[PDB]
Structure formats: structure tokens, C-alpha cells
Amino acid sequence: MPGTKRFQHVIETPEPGKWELSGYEAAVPITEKSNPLTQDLDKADAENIVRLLGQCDAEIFQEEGQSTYQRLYSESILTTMVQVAGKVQEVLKEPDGGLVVLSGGGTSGRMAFLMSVSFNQLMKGLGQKPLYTYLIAGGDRSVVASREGTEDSALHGIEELKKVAAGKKRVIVIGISVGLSAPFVAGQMDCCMNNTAVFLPVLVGFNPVSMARNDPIEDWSSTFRQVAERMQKMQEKQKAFVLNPAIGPEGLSGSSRMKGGSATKILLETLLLAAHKTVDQGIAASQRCLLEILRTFERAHQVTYSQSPKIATLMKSVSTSLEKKGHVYLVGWQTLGIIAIMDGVECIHTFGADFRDVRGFLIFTFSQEDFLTSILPSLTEIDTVVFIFTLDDNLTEVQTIVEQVKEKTNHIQALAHSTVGQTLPIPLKKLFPSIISITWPLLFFEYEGNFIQKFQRELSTKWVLNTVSTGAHVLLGKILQNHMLDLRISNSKLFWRALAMLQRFSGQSKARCIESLLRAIHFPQPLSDDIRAAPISCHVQVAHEKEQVIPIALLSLLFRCSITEAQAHLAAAPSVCEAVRSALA
Numbered sequence: 332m333p334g335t336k337r338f339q340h341v342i343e344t345p346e347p348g349k350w351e352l353s354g355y356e357a358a359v360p361i362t363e364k365s366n367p368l369t370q371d372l373d374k375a376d377a378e379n380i381v382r383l384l385g386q387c388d389a390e391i392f393q394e395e396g397q398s399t400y401q402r403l404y405s406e407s408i409l410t411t412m413v414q415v416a417g418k419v420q421e422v423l424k425e426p427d428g429g430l431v432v433l434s435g436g437g438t439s440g441r442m443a444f445l446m447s448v449s450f451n452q453l454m455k456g457l458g459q460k461p462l463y464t465y466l467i468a469g470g471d472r473s474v475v476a477s478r479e480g481t482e483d484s485a486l487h488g489i490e491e492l493k494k495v496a497a498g499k500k501r502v503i504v505i506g507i508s509v510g511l512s513a514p515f516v517a518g519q520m521d522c523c524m525n526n527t528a529v530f531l532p533v534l535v536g537f538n539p540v541s542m543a544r545n546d547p548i549e550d551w552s553s554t555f556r557q558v559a560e561r562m563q564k565m566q567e568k569q570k571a572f573v574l575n576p577a578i579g580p581e582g583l584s585g586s587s588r589m590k591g592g593s594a595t596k597i598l599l600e601t602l603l604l605a606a607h608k609t610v611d612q613g614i615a616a617s618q619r620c621l622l623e624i625l626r627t628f629e630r631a632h633q634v635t636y637s638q639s640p641k642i643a644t645l646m647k648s649v650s651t652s653l654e655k656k657g658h659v660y661l662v663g664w665q666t667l668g669i670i671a672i673m674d675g676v677e678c679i680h681t682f683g684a685d686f687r688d689v690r691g692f693l694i695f696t697f698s699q700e701d702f703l704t705s706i707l708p709s710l711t712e713i714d715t716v717v718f719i720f721t722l723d724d725n726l727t728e729v730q731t732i733v734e735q736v737k738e739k740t741n742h743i744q745a746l747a748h749s750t751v752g753q754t755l756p757i758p759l760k761k762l763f764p765s766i767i768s769i770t771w772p773l774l775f776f777e778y779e780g781n782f783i784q785k786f787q788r789e790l791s792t793k794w795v796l797n798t799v800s801t802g803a804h805v806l807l808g809k810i811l812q813n814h815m816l817d818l819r820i821s822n823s824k825l826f827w828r829a830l831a832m833l834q835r836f837s838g839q840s841k842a843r844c845i846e847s848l849l850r851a852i853h854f855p856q857p858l859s860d861d862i863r864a865a866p867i868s869c870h871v872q873v874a875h876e877k878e879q880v881i882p883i884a885l886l887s888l889l890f891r892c893s894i895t896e897a898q899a900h901l902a903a904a905p906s907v908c909e910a911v912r913s914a915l916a
């Protein structure tokens with residue numbers, strides 16, 4: 332019947348109470364699952380939120396128990412990390428013809444970029460030709476932009492790969508889809524597999540290959556699962572690899588920017604750092620070299636979250652600036668400024684936030700006087716400004732910018748990374764009464780940029796800003812339990828997520844839930860057969876443009892009413908948050 336070809340794969344809503352017995356719950360991929368720790372994230376205060384998220388983040392480093400999915404510290408994963416590090420060596424031994432590509436949509440593409448730089452630096456510091464590069468869904472503009480819709484084309488991702496692989500002779504291609512979901516990556520890997528002689532695909536993400544996304548891709552004949560299964564087969568001959576540890580669900584469901592992006596870094600820096608540091612030591616990568624790194628990264632979670640009360644306080648002050656109607660500025664030097672940007676831009680699609688709400692700045696990329704003249708005028712009593720830097724930075728430039736802002740804001744806090752017994756100039760650097768100095772044990776680095784110290788710092792920053800920003804908005808009511816209900820459908824994965832939220836919250840049938848969603852999207856056109864049968868892209872292009880689509884569809888379903896009736900019900904409640912919450916009673 333009209334539709335069956337597009338919604339056939341969607342599991343039926345289970346009957347109340349049998350959500351697990353139905354077998355439904357075991358097919359929700361980990362990345363999309365509801366984390367049990369965050370059942371009530373919408374009733375945690377800023378102190379509980381930092382706890383529960385900091386807890387969630389810890390699950391990256393949990394070990395495998397006794398019938399269970401492989402995790403990061405399991406032997407099959409470390410073994411794969413070694414073999415891959417291995418394959419990165421063959422390419423470092425042969426830079427003429429060689430390339431290494433790090434590719435992802437969204438935050439996976441963001442993490443890819445950062446790492447491609449760091450390891451380019453590492454080879455610059457050694458006077459080696461840089462071999463890393465990156466590919467992001469939507470081209471390089473995508474790095475610092477919200478562009479959710481660009482990940483849905485396999486041919487796109489393939490074209491980008493054909494470009495950058497020029498007339499190279501040996502190309503390692505690392506595809507990063509946290510969900511083993513994004514068509515961008517799917518094509519790249521599948522294509523890699525058609526020319527083994529040149530290419531080596533390494534798929535990275537955080538679901539088992541049996542939860543790999545399996546719906547049809549519009550411009551491609553195989554699904555991610557098929558492509559992933561076939562790579563897993565090629566691993567036995569070392570011509571492809573899948574690195575897919577489980578790290579547990581996200582604190583905010585399907586927010587793979589967070590634990591997924593963290594784990595992407597932890598997992599990839601480790602592996603690559605290991606492969607570098609060990610080539611010119613004349614030695615093969617061992618698990619022992621890897622674990623040195625992972626344990627350092629593990630220490631960093633504990634280092635980072637031991638400043639939780641302060642993290643909670645900064646969040647409170649970001650939540651209030653927004654609760655009024657003011658803005659937040661994340662001000663950062665070097666890489667930690669980029670991460671600031673990427674946290675800000677990510678807030679847009681993740682929260683229906685506007686590009687000023689939580690903005691990032693690198694010294695997007697404005698200079699010292701430049702930022703003084705341009706942005707400094709626009710500030711206000713109620714804002715918040717956050718300063719992000721190490722003591723190795725250049726604090727003459729830093730003190731300047733804060734002194735000027737103190738006048739006009741007085742809601743400033745700060746994030747400062749330091750080796751033990753570095754000291755903060757200006758004994759009256761108060762300024763920041765209650766800093767977040769984060770103080771790093773001296774480690775034994777041999778590389779001239781101290782790249783391992785870099786990653787500790789980047790990650791620690793990412794955890795803070797993720798938790799800050801993500802937390803701020805929870806406090807403001809916009810999260811439902813641990814789901815963002817009212818998201819903007821801007822690619823196919825988000826469309827399915829919306830639909831899955833409808834089935835869960837309403838408990839009503841798959842057909843009914845699809846019908847309500849499609850009506851809410853295309854209102855005032857009614858459901859024709861053309862519409863029912865249309866590719867998910869068509870829905871997305873129309874929904875992406877609209878507001879409250881999901882909450883309207885859910886209301887229609889609960890009240891049993893028309894779209895017309897529920898639009899007027901929405902406009903007759905004080906807020907979307909309150910309408911939805913009480914319809915659920």
C-alpha cells in the first residue's frame with residue numbers, strides 16, 4: 332500500500348509493559364537509547380546534571396562484564412587499534428603517494444578536522460610532509476556551521492573523497508559515524524572497498540555492527556549495516572577495519588556530539604599518537620603503549636569532573652543569562668577557542684537555539700582590538716562571558732579583554748589549564764575570584780608540541796562546555812525526560828528519531844504516529860498517496876522549515892484531534908513545554 336516501501340522497516344509500537352518482551356528495546360541502537368541514569372534529567376538541578384553527565388561520560392571507560400557488547404578496554408578493540416596503528420605506520424614509512432583521511436558528518440566531521448590538524452602539526456614539528464586531511468559533510472564551511480542536512484548523500488561523501496584522493500597511491504580512510512548511520516560515510520567506505528589496492532577503510536563509531544543503521548539511503552543501494560558487515564568480513568584479511576566499542580547511551584538521547592565526539596577523540600588520538608611515537612622508536616605499537624594513553628585520558632575525566640561544583644555554578648549563570656534574554660560568549664585561544672565555537676554552533680540544532688545564544692570566539696575568529704571594538708559594545712548586565720586558555724597562552728592579551736568586559740558584564744567565570752606550579756599573574760587576578768584552574772600532573776612527553784598535553788586539554792574543555800551548554804538548556808525546561816522532543820527535522824536520522832519519540836510518548840500505533848507526523852509536516856495539504864509514498868527527503872525539506880512540528884503531531888495524537896484543532900490548542904497554552912507536559916498527564 333502507499334507508504335509501505337518507506338516505513339516497512341520501522342518497528343511497531345509495543346503494547347504497554349511489553350516494550351522489552353516485544354524485542355523492541357534490543358533493536359534501538361545504543362546511540363539512540365535512553366540512558367537510565369538520566370531518566371529525570373529534567374528535574375535534576377545544576378549540581379545533579381553535572382553529576383549525571385559526568386557519570387554518563389565515565390561510561391566511555393567502563394570495562395566489559397561477563398554475554399555483552401565489546402567496550403573500549405576489551406581485547407578485540409585494543410587488538411584492532413593496534414592493527415590499525417600498524418597500517419598507519421606503512422603509510423608513514425612511505426609519504427610519497429600516501430594520505431590519511433578523517434571523515435564525518437556533523438560533530439564527527441568536526442572531530443575529524445581538529446585531529447587532522449594536531450597530527451599535521453606533529454609532522455610539522457618533525458619537518459615531515461603532512462599526510463592527514465579531513466572531509467566533512469557539506470565541505471569545509473561545515474566545520475563551524477550548523478548544517479544537519481548535508482550528511483544524507485552517499486554520492487556527496489564519495490565525491491569529496493574522490494577529490495582529496497587526487498593521484499595518491501595509498502589512502503587510509505577513517506569514516507566516523509557514531510551511529511554507524513551517516514550516508515556520507517557509508518558511501519566512502521563502500522567505495523574504498525571496491526579498490527583495496529589503493530584504499531583502506533576504517534569505520535569508527537559506537538554501536539555494534541548489528542545495530543548499524545539499516546534503512547535505505549536515497550542515493551545508494553546498500554545500507555550502512557551491509558557496508559559495515561562486509562568490512563567486518565574484510566578485517567580477517569586486514570584490508571578493512573571496524574572500531575566499534577560501546578560507550579553506553581548519551582545523557583541526552585541521540586546527542587552524539589557529547590559522549591560520541593569525546594570517544595571519537597579518545598579512541599583516535601590514542602591510536603594515531605601510538606602509531607607515530609612508535610615508528611621512530613623502531614618498535615611496533617603494543618597494547619601497552621595504547622593503554623598508557625587511554626589511562627591518561629581516563630585520568631582526565633577525574634581531573635575534569637573534580638571541579639564539578641564550579642562547573643555547576645558556571646552552568647547556573649549561563650542558564651540565567653538565557654532565562655532572561657541575554658547572550659553567552661565563549662572566548663578561547665588556539666584550539667580551545669575552536670572547540671568553544673563548535674560547542675556554540677552545535678547548540679543551534681540541538682536546542683533550537685539562535686546563533687547568538689551561545690556563541691564562540693577564537694583569538695567566529697576575531698582578533699584582539701577587533702573583538703574589543705566589534706563585539707564589546709553589545710554586552711550587558713545580564714550576559715555571561717567565558718574565557719578559555721592555558722597559562723602557556725599569552726595572558727597580556729587575555730587580561731586586556733577581561734578588564735574591558737568586567738566593566739560591562741560582571742558575570743564572568745573562566746577555564747584555565749596549567750601544569751602543576753604554574754602561577755596566575757596579577758595576584759589580584761580576581762577578576763576571577765572563583766576560577767576553574769585545571770592543573771595537569773607533569774607527564775613525560777617526548778614530542779616538541781607536547782601533543783598528549785594538548786588532547787587532555789581539548790577533551791577536558793569539551794566535557795565542560797558540553798555539560799555547561801547542554802545543562803543550561805535542560806534547566807530551562809526544553810528537554811523532556813531525557814529527550815529533546817521539539818527538534819528540527821533537518822535530515823533523515825532526525826525524522827526517524829521524531830517518529831520514534833512519537834511512538835514512545837504516545838504508545839499509539841506506527842501507522843497512526845506516521846500519519847500524525849506527516850500531517851503536521853505538510854499541513855495545510857492533506858495526506859495524498861504522493862505524500863505517503865514520498866522519499867524521506869521530501870518530508871525533511873518541508874519540516875526543516877517549520878516550528879513545533881513534533882509537539883503538534885504528538886498533541887494531535889493524544890487529544891485524538893485534527894492538526895487544526897491541536898495548533899489552536901498549542902496557541903492557547905502558555906508554552907509548548909507546558910502544553911505538551913499536561914497533554915501527557
Ligand SMILES: CC#CC[C@@](O)(c1ccc(N2CCN(S(=O)(=O)c3ccc(N)nc3)C[C@@H]2C#CC)cc1)C(F)(F)F
Nearest residue numbers: 360363364365510512542543544824827828831832835
Ligand atoms: C521517549 C522515546 C523515544 C525514542 C526512542 O524510542 C528511540 C529513539 C531513536 C530511535 N531511532 C532513531 C534513528 N533511527 S535510524 O533509522 O535513523 C538509525 C540511526 C542509527 C542507527 N545505528 N540505526 C538506525 C533508528 C531508531 C528508530 C526509529 C523509528 C528509536 C527509538 C528511545 F526512547 F528509545 F530513545
Ligand SMILES: O=P(O)(O)OC[C@@H](O)[C@@H](O)[C@H](O)[C@@H](O)CO
Nearest residue numbers: 437438439508509510513587588
Ligand atoms: O556521527 P553520526 O552518528 O554519524 O552523526 C553525525 C551528526 O548527525 C551529529 O554529529 C549531529 O550533527 C550532532 O548534533 C549530534 O548531536
